[PDB]
């Protein structure tokens, strides 16, 4: 009965440790790299939007300068 328990525990430990290691070396690393990619591309959307809005504000400043010249 110690031996039948022993062999069954030895299998159940290996199955459990394969799940723990699959989480530790596959599932968590896919998630952490996915999240690092997401945080990077979210900053890319933020800089794209910043650049567009900066050019819009510049174009509005140019329109104001043209209007001030047209008022001469």
């Amino acid at each position: 009965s110690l031996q039948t328990s022993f062999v069954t525990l030895d299998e159940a430990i290996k199955i459990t440790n394969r799940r723990v290691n699959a989480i530790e070396h596959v599932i968590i690393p896919r998630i952490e790299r996915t999240l690092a990619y997401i945080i990077t591309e979210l900053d890319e959307r933020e800089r794209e939007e910043f650049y567009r809005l900066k050019k819009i504000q510049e174009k509005k400043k140019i329109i104001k300068e043209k209007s001030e010249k047209d008022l001469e």
Partner: protein, 410 residues
């Protein structure tokens, strides 16, 4: 004659594309085939083979003429083309002749002025539409359509236009569309009838190696063939690095009417090859968290044949003479043997797992280890040294040898 490059050269009609563009490469010709008149992209990270494929179509294809557009590509690309193409030869009418006699180069190497990239693309397609009107089946390589899109980005930036994504202009989709739509098979203009074509092959080079890139995204919505190159295969020097999960061709329904004539055995084999590879991925996602001991013996056979297909079919060395080119008769014969092993090995297990006399993958490997080695050896057969009858006879002998070995396990 002088033609405005931005204006499409007219045609009597744009015919459906219905004949394969046979290339240098097994995976292309077999599993993701281009058609004469088809629009194709090769999106890939740096150092994947996008130019080796571009060169290999240009060196080895059934195209009558090639226009090779070095748009934004490295300088030594043009030197490698000018080194190889005068020395490399096709044969016509029993005469050996240099393939440079059928190629034109439109260089615009990465350091040459950024604006000339746009003019280079439109020059190469205008040359390609000119030989298309002669009835020649033209093929046009574009060595990076994203290095073109970057020139549109730069001029658009200097003009201070509003960008769409990553700084690219909003018209980038239409600029790419009105380039790839210049492909086709056509009833040419004018009196004598011709059936010329332009086939376009855009070696898209996505920034960071990421196919979410706007040039890749816009290109994928426009082409009908996608040979996505995976950097992880190229790192392993698994070449050509075409990822068989992501890649596709929309021309298969149009090409089935050609295969049913010239290669009636092939369409089942193409289907089984894709299925075996798909099953290997759907198995691998399990194995990676539990170990190979979890699998059924049919699934060990599926994994092992998917390794044969990966390492000996899909892989092809474009420099070594045995794999420098691979005609379709070699390609089908190799694949027929690898799938003949699969169907027999799978039948052997399924026939005997019902009984105490059960066959297993290890039983097959120990009785047939020489057959596995011979199956992998099939790539070394050389069409320069070995006649068609010799390669066909050797491949028929492997079919018979496998059949008699599996009959000896049952």
């Amino acid at each position: 004659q002088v033609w405005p490059v931005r204006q499409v050269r007219p045609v009597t009609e744009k015919l459906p594309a219905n004949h394969p563009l046979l290339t240098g490469q097994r995976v292309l010709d077999a599993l993701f085939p281009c058609v004469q008149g088809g629009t194709t992209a090769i999106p890939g990270a740096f150092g994947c083979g996008k130019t080796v494929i571009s060169q290999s179509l240009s060196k080895y294809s059934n195209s009558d003429v090639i226009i090779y557009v070095g748009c934004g590509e490295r300088g030594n690309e043009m030197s490698e083309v000018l080194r190889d193409f005068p020395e490399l030869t096709m044969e016509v009418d029993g005469k050996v002749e240099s393939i440079m006699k059928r190629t034109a180069l439109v260089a615009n190497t990465s350091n040459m002025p950024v604006a000339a990239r746009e003019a280079s693309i439109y020059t190469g397609i205008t040359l390609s539409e000119y030989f298309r009107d002669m009835g020649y089946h033209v093929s046009m390589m574009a060595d990076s359509t994203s290095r073109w899109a970057e020139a549109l980005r730069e001029i658009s930036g200097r003009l201070a236009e509003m960008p769409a994504d990553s700084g690219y202009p909003a018209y980038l989709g239409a600029r790419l569309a009105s380039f790839y739509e210049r492909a086709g098979r056509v009833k040419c203009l004018g009196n004598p009838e011709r059936e010329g074509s332009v086939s376009i092959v855009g070696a898209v080079s996505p920034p960071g190696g990421d196919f979410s890139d706007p040039v890749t995204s816009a290109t994928l919505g426009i082409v009908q063939v996608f040979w996505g190159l995976d950097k992880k295969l190229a790192q392993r020097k698994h070449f050509p690095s075409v990822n068989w999960l992501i890649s596709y061709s929309k021309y298969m329904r149009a090409l089935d009417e050609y295969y049913d004539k010239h290669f009636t055995e092939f369409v089942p084999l193409r289907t089984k090859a894709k299925e075996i590879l798909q099953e290997e991925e759907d198995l691998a996602e399990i194995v990676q968290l539990v170990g190979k001991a979890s699998l059924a013996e049919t699934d060990k056979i599926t994994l092992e044949v998917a390794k044969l297909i990966k390492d000996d079919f899909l892989q092809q060395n474009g420099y070594t003479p045995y794999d420098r080119f691979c005609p379709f008769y070699k390609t089908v014969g190799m694949l027929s043997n690898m799938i003949s092993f699969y169907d027999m090995a799978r039948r052997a297990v399924e026939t005997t797992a019902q009984s105490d006399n059960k066959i297993t993958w290890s039983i097959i490997r120990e009785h047939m280890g020489e057959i596995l080695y011979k199956l992998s050896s099939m790539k070394f057969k050389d069409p320069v040294k070995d006649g068609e009858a010799k390669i066909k006879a050797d491949y028929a002998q492997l079919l018979e040898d496998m059949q008699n070995a599996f009959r000896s396990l049952e």
